[PDB]
Amino acid sequence: STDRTGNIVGKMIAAINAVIKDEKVSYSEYKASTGWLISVGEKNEWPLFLDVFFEHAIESVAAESNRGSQSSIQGPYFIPGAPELSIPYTMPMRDDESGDTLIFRGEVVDQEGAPLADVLLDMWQADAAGEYSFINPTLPDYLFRGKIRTDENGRFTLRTIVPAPYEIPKNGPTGALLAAAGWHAWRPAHLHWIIAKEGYESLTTQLYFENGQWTGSDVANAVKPELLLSLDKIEAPHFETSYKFTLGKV
Amino acid sequence: STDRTGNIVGKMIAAINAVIKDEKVSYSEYKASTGWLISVGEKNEWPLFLDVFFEHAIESVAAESNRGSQSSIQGPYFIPGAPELSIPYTMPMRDDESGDTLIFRGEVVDQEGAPLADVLLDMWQADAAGEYSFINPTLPDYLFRGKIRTDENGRFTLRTIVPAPYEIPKNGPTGALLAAAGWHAWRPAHLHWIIAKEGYESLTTQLYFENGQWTGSDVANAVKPELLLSLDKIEAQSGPHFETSYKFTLGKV
Numbered sequence: 397s398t399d400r401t402g403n404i405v406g407k408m409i410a411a412i413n414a415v416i417k418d419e420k421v422s423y424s425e426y427k428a429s430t431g432w433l434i435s436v437g438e439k440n441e442w443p444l445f446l447d448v449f450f451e452h453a454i455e456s457v458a459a460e461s462n463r464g465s466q467s468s469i470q471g472p473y474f475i476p477g478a479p480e481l482s483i484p485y486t487m488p489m490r491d492d493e494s495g496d497t498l499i500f501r502g503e504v505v506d507q508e509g510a511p512l513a514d515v516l517l518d519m520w521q522a523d524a525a526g527e528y529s530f531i532n533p534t535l536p537d538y539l540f541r542g543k544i545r546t547d548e549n550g551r552f553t554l555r556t557i558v559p560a561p562y563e564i565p566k567n568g569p570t571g572a573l574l575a576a577a578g579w580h581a582w583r584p585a586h587l588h589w590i591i592a593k594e595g596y597e598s599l600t601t602q603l604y605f606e607n608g609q610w611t612g613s614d615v616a617n618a619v620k621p622e623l624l625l626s627l628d629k630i631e632a633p634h635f636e637t638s639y640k641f642t643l644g645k646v
Numbered sequence: 647s648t649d650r651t652g653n654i655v656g657k658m659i660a661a662i663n664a665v666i667k668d669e670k671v672s673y674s675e676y677k678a679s680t681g682w683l684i685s686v687g688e689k690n691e692w693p694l695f696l697d698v699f700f701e702h703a704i705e706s707v708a709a710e711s712n713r714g715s716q717s718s719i720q721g722p723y724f725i726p727g728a729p730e731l732s733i734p735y736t737m738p739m740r741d742d743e744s745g746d747t748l749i750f751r752g753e754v755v756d757q758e759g760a761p762l763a764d765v766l767l768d769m770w771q772a773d774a775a776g777e778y779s780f781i782n783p784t785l786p787d788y789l790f791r792g793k794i795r796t797d798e799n800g801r802f803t804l805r806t807i808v809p810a811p812y813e814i815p816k817n818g819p820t821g822a823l824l825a826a827a828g829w830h831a832w833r834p835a836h837l838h839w840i841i842a843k844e845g846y847e848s849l850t851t852q853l854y855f856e857n858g859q860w861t862g863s864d865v866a867n868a869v870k871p872e873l874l875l876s877l878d879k880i881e882a883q884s885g886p887h888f889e890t891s892y893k894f895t896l897g898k899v
């Protein structure tokens with residue numbers, strides 16, 4: 397512990413000091429950086445900042461041990477206690493909710509490819525303007541957050557709308573850093589999932605949309621090729637898609 | 647420039663991510679680190695943390711452009727407004743202040759080695775228990791903080807006490823990290839100085855004591871060999887005391 401903490405923290409501090417020496421970071425830049433770091437804490441952006449820049453690396457080590465299908469970062473906007481939904485499964489939406497309807501057909505199987513029943517899935521997403529409930533408190537509580545279960549056939553059908561890409565807020569320290577550094581502040585459109593069943597290893601993941609704006613260029617670096625969804629446009633239009641998740645036994 | 651700040655911050659982030667990958671840093675470690683970072687801000691320890699681990703590197707690049715004598719980090723405990731001391735210059739001390747008496751003979755010269763008169767020097771130090779005024783609010787305000795001036799000969803004599811070495815306090819996040827990484831939290835004993843005169847570049851520096859513990863393992867990595875003082879023990883009326891001499895140089899603007 398003492399040995400390991402020293403090793404990891406020492407290497408990180410050393411690497412930062414090597415860049416300071418290499419780039420000849422100035423006192424003026426140090427003072428600005430001090431003010432900025434203070435502002436991250438004052439604006440409660442530690443989880444946002446860290447999950448943008450570092451969670452993907454943490455998650456990549458964890459993923460080496462994956463026993464089911466492909467995983468991704470959680471990100472900072474999970475909220476516990478999202479509503480248990482009812483058939484026909486519909487994400488919490490307003491009567492006049494903007495956006496293109498999406499019907500998502502899900503399957504959850506084990507390592508043999510056998511369906512898993514009574515799997516719990518938490519899903520959350522941004523609305524068509526790229527806003528999350530609770531995070532934006534002008535949205536109705538629990539908008540676009542819910543829990544559903546699989547069938548005896550390991551299946552569910554879920555109606556929602558296609559989320560918009562998400563921008564790290566420009567009026568915060570993290571957004572200020574991204575602007576200052578000349579880096580785009582966008583995540584591609586995505587659906588978050590936490591998938592659990594007693595006796596199985598849980599799966600935290602994200603799904604994106606093939607050729608979506610920002611999918612090759614995620615600020616959070618959290619996309620993986622296995623996690624791209626293809627959409628069929630259906631006339632009546634709305635979009636339809638499907639995905640199979642895999643859980644590994646404990 | 648966006649180019650420059652992106653280059654610097656990009657390199658830092660990549661470097662931290664390489665360490666995460668090589669050391670297999672876990673989600674549990676990431677969450678503990680998140681809570682730790684939050685605590686740094688909640689306890690107002692950003693200047694302390696950064697000044698412990700990073701200011702030496704910043705100061706070392708700054709120092710390559712020095713026009714005068716050797717410089718060092720400022721650290722986070724300077725407080726403006728210290729009293730102008732009166733002759734014979736004596737640092738603000740309590741009537742029963744403990745510790746060994748130190749007589750410090752200073753000189754300030756220009757880059758030709760000629761004396762500089764009316765140089766203003768701000769000096770601060772810890773007491774014989776390793777505590778700073780304001781920082782530890784139970785000490786009298788401006789204890790061991792004072793301003794003096796060089797005379798016509800560029801000289802001054804200052805009476806004080808030998809400061810103790812300092813531990814970064816474990817009761818805060820910076821000290822908690824040092825403790826958790828198995829690293830000593832000590833700075834060797836030192837006198838801090840900000841030295842200024844119109845038409846000259848200011849000098850920030852620290853002076854340490856040759857014989858002192860921690861000069862080879864400063865938690866802050868701010869010791870430089872030009873800044874080590876030698877002490878002479880003087881036995882004379884009544885009690886032994888210590889004397890030391892230093893010559894500072896300022897370079898013109």
Ligand SMILES: O=C(NO)c1ccccc1
Pocket residue numbers: 444447448469470471472473562564583616618
């Ligand atoms: O939506 C996200 N999922 O990762 C996200 C949002 C902000 C910062 C990091 C991640």
Ligand SMILES: O=C(NO)c1ccccc1
Pocket residue numbers: 694697698719720721722723724814833866
């Ligand atoms: O030198 C110091 N005296 O204030 C100092 C430097 C870095 C961190 C803590 C203290």
Ligand SMILES: [Fe+3]
Pocket residue numbers: 471473522562586588
């Ligand atoms: Fe998200």
Ligand SMILES: [Fe+3]
Pocket residue numbers: 721723772812836838
């Ligand atoms: Fe000090």
Ligand SMILES: [Mg+2]
Pocket residue numbers: 458461462463597
């Ligand atoms: Mg796992």
Ligand SMILES: [Mg+2]
Pocket residue numbers: 708711712713847
């Ligand atoms: Mg200079």
Ligand SMILES: [Mg+2]
Pocket residue numbers: 709710711712
């Ligand atoms: Mg030089």
